[PDB]
UniProtKB/Swiss-Prot annotation, chain A:
Name used for this protein in its record: ATP synthase subunit b
Known function: F(1)F(0) ATP synthase produces ATP from ADP in the presence of a proton or sodium gradient. F-type ATPases consist of two structural domains, F(1) containing the extramembraneous catalytic core and F(0) containing the membrane proton channel, linked together by a central stalk and a peripheral stalk. During catalysis, ATP synthesis in the catalytic domain of F(1) is coupled via a rotary mechanism of the central stalk subunits to proton translocation.
Highest taxon above the source species: Bacteria
Disulfide bonds, paired cysteine numbers: none
Taxonomic path: Bacteria, Pseudomonadati, Pseudomonadota, Gammaproteobacteria, Pseudomonadales
Family as reported in the entry's similarity comment: Belongs to the ATPase B chain family.
Summary of subunit composition and partner proteins: F-type ATPases have 2 components, F(1) - the catalytic core - and F(0) - the membrane proton channel. F(1) has five subunits: alpha(3), beta(3), gamma(1), delta(1), epsilon(1). F(0) has three main subunits: a(1), b(2) and c(10-14). The alpha and beta chains form an alternating ring which encloses part of the gamma chain. F(1) is attached to F(0) by a central stalk formed by the gamma and epsilon chains, while a peripheral stalk is formed by the delta and b chains.
Gene coding for it: atpF
Subcellular location: Cell inner membrane
Length: 52, 52
């Protein structure tokens, strides 16, 4: 029982640490998207002010 | 019937059987008795550690 408890405990903690890293990578994809959209928005806005 | 004889003989014979039991018989039996209690105590404690 003690060995089985340690195997199940260790295995589920692997899943949790793997899932935690996957959550952070998706946040990095989102973070790159929102600064890319801002950098392209800023490019169109500076074009508007120069034409004005 | 009552005649006083063999009183010292039985008195000495009793001490011989008492000290023999004290040295040889008594200690090994208590050690073996305690080992079962210790093994069961470790087993019940280990089952609690597994849940904890």
């Amino acid at each position: 029982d003690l060995e089985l408890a340690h195997e199940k405990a260790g295995q589920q903690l692997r899943e949790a640490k793997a899932q935690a890293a996957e959550i952070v990578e998706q946040a990095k994809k989102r973070a790159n998207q929102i600064v890319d959209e801002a950098r392209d928005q800023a490019r169109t806005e500076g074009e508007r002010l120069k034409a004005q | 019937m009552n005649i006083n004889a063999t009183l010292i003989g039985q008195s000495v014979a009793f001490f011989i059987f008492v000290l023999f039991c004290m040295k040889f018989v008594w200690p090994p039996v208590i050690a073996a008795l305690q080992e079962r209690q210790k093994k069961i105590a470790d087993g019940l404690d280990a089952a609690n550690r597994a849940a904890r």
